[PDB]
Amino acid sequence: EKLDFLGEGQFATVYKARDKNTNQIVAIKKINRTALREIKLLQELSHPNIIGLLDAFGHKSNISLVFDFMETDLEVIIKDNSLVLTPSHIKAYMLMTLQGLEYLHQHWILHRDLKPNNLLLDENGVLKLADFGLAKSFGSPNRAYTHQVVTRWYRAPELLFGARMYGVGVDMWAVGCILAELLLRVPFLPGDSDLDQLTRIFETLGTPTEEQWPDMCSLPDYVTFKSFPGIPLHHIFSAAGDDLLDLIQGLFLFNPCARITATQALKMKYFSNRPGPTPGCQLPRPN
Ligand SMILES: Nc1ncnc2c1ncn2[C@@H]1O[C@H](COP(=O)(O)OP(=O)(O)OP(=O)(O)O)[C@@H](O)[C@H]1O
């Protein structure tokens, strides 16, 4: 049962609803084997910080995916919302994202499409991860009708240099970008193009030596960069403490293996150190 239009999305119209009898309030997403597999998986998954797929239904010409409804996403919190202000809140979000991600990884799944608007928050400030992209998005491809800027601003360098093999590091990089967005309140690396995006990565983070990233060059789309010295994280992130700086550190290591994993991240001082995560209805909502 329809109840409201919520927004257009890269690859879906999204509609608030109390689903046929289903009294839970719900968001339906409107748009071939692999896609069916992805649907039944996200479905089979079960984790406090992973979005709930509740049904899919549809006859070839349309698919509709049913997720429990979320107040907002982490973008609207970052975004313009100067009402909202984030300290040590930031710890909570990361705590969740990583746990959410740790689970995903443990379950041999890369969320391949993290960005602030796929880290959703429910009424009670539980952060859940959005559908791992393809689970709609590119899975079943016909694009919506939408405006709104598009966002490759979280691609790891390995994907921008067109690695046709990737892993956890892909997600961990995006998390790094999110953690940045949070602290910076602007997009950390807002590139116009993959190439521009690689520029902003390198002039911010430094150009990686072969010592830092090995195998960096034989990357399919690799093309040579001025050798930028990069800005010391503490100069990018004044707000940041050393413990957090150390997590930003690991998430942005260039070499996808050196790059921190969601578990390893989680075990870092940041998440045990003293300004603990804000309990999360203490976690601020936008209007
Ligand atoms: N589970 C949900 N609960 C509440 N609102 C949602 C939910 N999922 C999507 N939305 C809303 O849908 C709109 C666009 O979201 P969506 O996640 O579909 O964008 P996208 O990830 O770019 O595109 P898509 O997921 O369709 O490829 C936003 O207004 C957002 O508030």
Swiss-Prot record:
Activity regulation, in the record's words, is: Inactivated by phosphorylation. Repressed by roscovitine (seliciclib, CYC202), R547 (Ro-4584820) and SNS-032 (BMS-387032). The association of p53/TP53 to the CAK complex in response to DNA damage reduces kinase activity toward CDK2 and RNA polymerase II repetitive C-terminal domain (CTD), thus stopping cell cycle progression. The inactivation by roscovitine promotes caspase-mediated apoptosis in leukemic cells. Specifically inactivated by THZ1.
A Pfam family it matches: Pkinase
The effect of residue 146 to A is: Total loss of activity. Total loss of transcriptional activity of the reconstituted TFIIH complex
Keywords of the record, alphabetical order, are:
Acetylation, ATP-binding, Cell cycle, Cell division, Cytoplasm, DNA damage, DNA repair, Kinase, Nucleotide-binding, Nucleus, Phosphoprotein, Serine/threonine-protein kinase, Transcription, Transcription regulation, Transferase
Q: Which InterPro entries match?
A: CDK, CDK7, Kinase-like_dom_sf, Prot_kinase_dom, Protein_kinase_ATP_BS, Ser/Thr_kinase_AS
EC number annotated for this UniProt entry: 2.7.11.22, 2.7.11.23
Query: Where along the chain is the active site annotated?
Result: 113
Determine if Transcription is one of this entry's keywords. Answer: yes
* Domain named Protein kinase: residues: 1-271
What are the inducing conditions? Repressed by DNA-bound peptides.
Outcome of swapping residue 29 to A: Total loss of activity
CDD domains assigned to the protein according to its UniProt record, in alphabetical order: STKc_CDK7 (cd07841)
In which residues is ATP bound?
6-14, 29
Q: Where in the cell is it found?
A: Nucleus; Cytoplasm; Cytoplasm, Perinuclear region
Please provide, alphabetically and separated by semicolons, the GO molecular function terms listed in this UniProt record: ATP binding; ATP-dependent activity, acting on DNA; cyclin-dependent protein serine/threonine kinase activity; protein kinase activity; protein serine kinase activity; protein serine/threonine kinase activity; RNA polymerase II CTD heptapeptide repeat kinase activity; RNA polymerase II CTD heptapeptide repeat S5 kinase activity
* One GO-annotated biological process of the protein: DNA repair
Catalysed reaction, written as an equation:
L-seryl-[protein] + ATP = O-phospho-L-seryl-[protein] + ADP + H(+); L-threonyl-[protein] + ATP = O-phospho-L-threonyl-[protein] + ADP + H(+); [DNA-directed RNA polymerase] + ATP = phospho-[DNA-directed RNA polymerase] + ADP + H(+)
Q: Which PROSITE patterns match?
A: PROTEIN_KINASE_ATP (PS00107), PROTEIN_KINASE_DOM (PS50011), PROTEIN_KINASE_ST (PS00108)
Gene3D superfamilies given in the database record: Phosphorylase Kinase, domain 1 (3.30.200.20), Transferase(Phosphotransferase) domain 1 (1.10.510.10)
**Expressed in which tissues:** Ubiquitous.
Per the record, residues carrying Phosphothreonine are 146
Annotated GO CC locations: CAK-ERCC2 complex; cyclin-dependent protein kinase holoenzyme complex; cytoplasm; cytosol; fibrillar center; male germ cell nucleus; nucleoplasm; nucleus
Summary of subunit composition and partner proteins = Associates primarily with cyclin-H (CCNH) and MAT1 to form the CAK complex. CAK can further associate with the core-TFIIH to form the TFIIH basal transcription factor; this complex is sensitive to UV light. The CAK complex binds to p53/TP53 in response to DNA damage. Interacts with CDK2, SF1/NR5A1, PUF60 and PRKCI. Interacts with HINT1.
- Stated name of the protein: Cyclin-dependent kinase 7
Give the organism's phylogenetic lineage. Answer: Eukaryota, Metazoa, Chordata, Craniata, Vertebrata
